[PDB]
Amino acid sequence: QRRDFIDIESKFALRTPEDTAEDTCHLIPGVAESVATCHFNHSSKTFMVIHGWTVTGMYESWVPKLVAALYKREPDSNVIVVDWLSRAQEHYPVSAGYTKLVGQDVARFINWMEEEFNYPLDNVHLLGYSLGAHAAGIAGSLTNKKVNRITGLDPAGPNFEYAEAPSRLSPDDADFVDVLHTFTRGSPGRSIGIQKPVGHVDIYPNGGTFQPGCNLVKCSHERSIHLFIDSLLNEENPSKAYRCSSKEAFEKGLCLSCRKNRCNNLGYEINKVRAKRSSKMYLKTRSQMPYKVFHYQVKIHFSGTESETHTNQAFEISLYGTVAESENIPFTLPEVSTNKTYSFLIYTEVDIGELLMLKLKWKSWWSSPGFAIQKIRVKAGETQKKVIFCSREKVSHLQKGKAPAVFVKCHDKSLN
Template sequence: MGKENICFFSLWIILGKIFASFSSDLEGTTNITATPLPTTTQWITDYSDIVSKFSLRTVDIPDDDMCYLVPGRPETIKECEFNPETQTFIVIHGWTVTGMFESWVPKLVSALYEREPSANVIVVDWLTRANQHYPTSANYTKVVGRDVAKFVSWLQKELQLPWERIHLLGYSLGAHVAGVAGNLTDHKISRITGLDPAGPTFEHADNQNTLSRDDAQFVDVLHTNTRGSPDRSIGIQKPVGHIDIYPNGGTFQPGCDIQNTLMGIALEGIKGLQNMDQLIKCSHERSIHLFIDSLLNLQQQSMAYRCNSKDAFNKGLCLSCRKNRCNKIGYNINKVRTARSTKMITPRCPSSSLPTWTSAT
């Protein structure tokens, strides 16, 4: 057996273990239907039970937590040099196998600063709760959402920060954290962007426990990994925002097939063996990289089109911008709020400028 065949055989063995582990986690999942924890009128100003951390990342060091904003300690606002006169982005990660921040976090932070140099980019650290069996982490989204709601409300009250300048960006389980937070604040947050919100346990959950169009003045969602039966696909299938965009149909993304991903991992040698989870996350994480692309590539913006079905779209029946039937993807989206969710599909987005898989930090 050649070295290449041995390498691929080893990769398949590891891949089988990863899929088995993920499947075993899903076997115990149940739909989240309980409402958030009971509250009183004073709950939002009680910071004693907050576990999540809030780091203000910098443009010079986007990959490390150098300064924490601590609810109830206004001096940390000055220490971290928070700018109350500009846009504030709050980035919320999802489920993690390693218990560490993934490599997309500093990439998104850097892209946000490149687009909005004077902005505040805050990263929510809920790693200790996100590094559990999936059903446990999924249930933690309620209490983490409470943490974020308390933090946002405290920051806004301390600085009289305009709600219109607050933008939450949540990936996977983090999208539902953002939804819970938006549902609990006493004033609507300006915008929540859901980056392929997690599907298992959330597909049939009520709006109080998932990201929904009621959680902010404007909610936009990118669905990039909806393959599989409802509540079993990695990303949620149902529309949950004012505008829901399904790149390449939303089920599967170019360059994320097993052959391409295995080859990329194999080329990394031993390091590649440590990143087999990218086979599962490739399409899921593509939502982040599409958003990053929208921040950086203003000259070639990706478009999405409203269509009744994927089949009609594939036949070329929906490629028109008449009557607001098209929109930009990601950061540059036209914020149109309608009476019901608007589903949009993109033409086949090229994968040449986007990673098919990324190494973990």
């Protein structure tokens, strides 16, 4: 009965696959009749879209895109857009505080669904962007039983970074909490996106500080949405993220394993792996959709006769596979030295197939410096295989600004 739901300000609109942009039909808490009018499928899963702050008090471009992607992937489901634009259009610390009440409004609506129609909370997936992520968190900590999943799409950082579990999005908020941190650039408490792990699985695309094609002032912040939209539209080819100690350890290709759940899928397809401690996970992406790239750890032992060291050196590696090829992939090495092994990450948009050939180029009074390399060890993340490339001749000579050293496949070991 609507006498107890009167204090709820937030509106819950149920959009259809054929009406994504407008908030045409409204599920009114306390009015059980409305649920039927809007044609809510009681046999289907429910998605709830909780927007973030909006200085215009208007739905952004991404709302009908996220809605439409959810109806492309799951056309029988129920997609609700939680309207809190009146509270979201305010000064940031105000709108931020308003998460405490938007969360309650949602929890109260969800709880009413379970009470009035005996709707399972295990059928509810909440998706919040910026402030919306924390509203989802708060809502989840207030529902009668625990909601299925909560996706954190770049949760807002200021006033949340130092916030205790109840006042923000946290792992206790649902059965599964997956988070996408895409714009952590800044000091703790002063980054648009929250830096710390707040879920069961926390993904940091491109180390989550900023995003490819972004350095229109919310490119890196919004990208968490489009990565999820990518995941819904390309269900068969998700991007993989790998559990790493640090972004610095990732860029050295040291974490690229899938053993004991040390890798997962980015987006909808994510494996619901509740870990003891929050797992930070990294990956690289493209500048545009589809964002999946292929990750490789390249190990090179630079052998030679006399000791030499060369700082911040530039190289170009070329990968030749069965399917296709990606030539002139550039990379740089802090230091390169005689009889020393260096490991580094190399990524490519191209599905090259099974690796066959690999060409290494060193980019430039005196005769050019050079090393003699016999083997190159490659670990391919996606296919979980260890590939050895070895010089056609006894040793290949990699000399600065000269012809590239050629290496052909000599071994394969699938790690599983």
